């Protein structure tokens, strides 16, 4: 099992989930930590998740804003968890497009 | 079953729900979607729902913000829906009454 | 079985949660009654409850901003509950402190 790490905000200053798409596979972890310009949180609506299941979305949904630097926050994509892309935004930079996409490996 | 598709904005530019009230049976589906003057959200408070379940009210909830014209989301009232009045509004447009109402019958 | 009842903004005007610390025994509610300068909310962060559970946090979460005098959410800390601490803060006055803590014994 692996953790990818995702930095929320770049090291320059770009308003970016870095990486943006990670491929993940079953029992793998994404770890996402605050890195630059925060307010970020970090988002997925009900129809960007595999089989648009609304409490998926929710229970991955980190809505609270996370203001501290090196704050984190990790979901374990595990083997219940359908195949497919999981898309996911930052509401306050929504503008910007801070955007991400997770793909759990099918 | 029937689909009951809410408008959110009317077309005129009013920040109401239209249908603000509507009526449903076990099956039924509300569809909202997005209409006039985006951004809105649907929320249903805790206590705004039959028997005050707070985890029914926010698995009701889409308390993220719907900007694009003709983004819609969906609730199947199904029949371990408890009947009674559940009642909901837009987070952006509380202050001009932006409510709305399902009654699940019995 | 006991309800701790906790004021969301104090009656001189200070943004806090007052009581801000409760020590709570399985079954005990608490209650937080809106009192002065709202809105507030009341959020737990997933890292705050005892083991980190993100459905526990998001399920205690009242995120939905409350404006009306004296409107209230409760909470029964119930056997299944985990002990230890539960770390609370009010996100439109997370600026200012105002955060509470519910200790739930072992
Ligand atoms: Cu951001
Ligand atoms: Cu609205
Ligand atoms: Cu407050
Ligand atoms: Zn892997
Ligand atoms: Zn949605
Ligand atoms: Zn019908
Ligand atoms: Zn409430
Ligand atoms: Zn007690
Ligand atoms: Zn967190």
């Known amino acids: ?47 960007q998740v595999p089989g648009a299941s609304k409490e998926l979305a929710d229970k991955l949904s980190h809505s609270q804003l996370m203001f501290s630097p090196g704050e984190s926050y990790e979901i374990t994509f595990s083997s219940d968890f359908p195949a497919g892309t999981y898309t996911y935004y930052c509401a306050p930079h929504r503008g910007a497009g801070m955007v991400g996409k997770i793909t759990v490996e099918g």
């Open 1 to 47: 099992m692996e953790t990818f790490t995702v930095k929320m905000g770049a090291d320059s200053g770009l308003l970016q989930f870095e990486p943006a798409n990670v491929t993940v596979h079953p029992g793998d972890t994404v770890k996402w930590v605050n890195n630059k310009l925060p307010p970020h949180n970090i988002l997925f609506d009900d129809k």
